Amino acid sequence: AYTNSFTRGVYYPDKVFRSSVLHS
Amino acid sequence: FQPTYGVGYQPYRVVVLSFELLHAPATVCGPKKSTNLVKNKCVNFNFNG
């Protein structure tokens, strides 16, 4: 069977703290 | 490997040290003596290198 992931499966890319920012 | 062989055919031991020199928290360090922590002054600092 199948289902839609929506916006699941994002993770922190590196062990650095960042705040109030948009990071590509 | 034989003791008589030419040097390019003799055995060498190799150790390769891979460093995870990352932004992650440390557990292997050089023998640097830590100081007390100064606050609210302009200072030089060195946190884990």
- For every residue of B26-37, which 3-state class applies, written as one string? CCCCCCCCCCCC
Contact B1, B10 (CB under 8 A): yes
Shortest distance, CA A7 to any CA of chain B (angstroms): 27
Shortest distance, CA B25 to any CA of chain A (angstroms): 9
Partners of A14 on chain B (C-beta within 8 Å) are 23
Partners of B24 on chain A (C-beta within 8 Å) are 15
Contact A14, B23 (CB under 8 A): yes
Q: Hey, CA dihedral for B2, B3, B5, B6, is it positive or negative?
A: positive
Contact B23, A18 (CB under 8 A): no
Residues 1-24 of A with CB under 8 A from B: 14-16
